[PDB]
Amino acid sequence: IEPINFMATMVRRVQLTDEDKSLLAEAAPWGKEIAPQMADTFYDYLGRDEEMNAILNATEGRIHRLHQTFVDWFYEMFTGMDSWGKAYAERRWKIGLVHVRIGIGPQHVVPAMAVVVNAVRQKLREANKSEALSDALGKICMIDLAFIEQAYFEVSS
Ligand code: HEM
User: Fold this and answer.
1) Residue stretches of the annotated binding site
2) For heme b, which residues are the binding ones (predicted)?
């Protein structure tokens, strides 16, 4: 309802610390480096699902937009935009409403998010990044997923 307030509840409930935020903000340049490959993995994953591939069929110009929206969203987890504040919360809430409007649900987004976290965890291990960075990214992916699921709850109901 009030994005900034939902954000404070989500950072407390997922236990995302000042330390986590520092690890994310420090890894941001690396996040920016891997984002395009993450976008490609995600696109291919969605493409292999009959139901989710049907949903991704508005136009071809959609491919660029689907790649770019993903790259910016992914990088933003590392920077937090306004340090995981009001603008972050408003952007995450708008992301939630977009998915509810196109008729995608928990059966799509919860697994999709499991695949993102799995794919990022592979990149982290490839690059021999810290386990503390890996935990922090797990936390912020799950904040973002709560925003999407909460939007679906509020727009449904
Ligand atoms: C962790 C999961 C996901 C994330 C983080 C994500 C992220 C995004 C973002 C940032 C946007 C742009 C929203 C905007 O306009 O402001 C978006 C749009 C979209 N997403 Fe997702 N998404 C996810 C899952 C999915 C899934 C499972 C589908 C299934 C097909 C999907 C289909 C779309 C479509 C069709 C759009 C609109 C693109 C357009 O404007 O033409 N997304 N998503």
Assistant:
1) 62, 65, 91, 99
2) 62, 65, 91, 99
Domain range enclosing 119? 1-157
Q: Tell me which H or E stretch contains 92.
A: helix 86-101
Ligand 1 mean position to 150 CA, how many Å?
A: 16
**Number of structural domains, the chain?**
1
142 close to ligand 1 (CB < 6 Angstrom): no
- Amino acid in position 135: D
Method underlying the structure: X-ray
Resolution as reported, in Å: 2.2
Residues 6 or more apart whose Cβ sits within 8 Å of residue 152: 96, 99, 100, 105, 106, 109
- The residues, any chain, with a CB within 8 Å of residue 92's CB and separated by 6 or more, are 3, 7, 143, 144, 147, 148
Ligand 1 binding pocket includes 116 (Cβ within 6 Å): yes
- Token pair, residue 46, equals 């969605």
**Is 77 close to ligand 1, i.e. is its CB under 6 Å away?**
no
Q: Ligand 1 center to residue 14 CA distance, Å? A: 23
Q: Is the CB of 117 under 6 A from ligand 1?
A: no
Amino acid in the structure at residue 103:
G
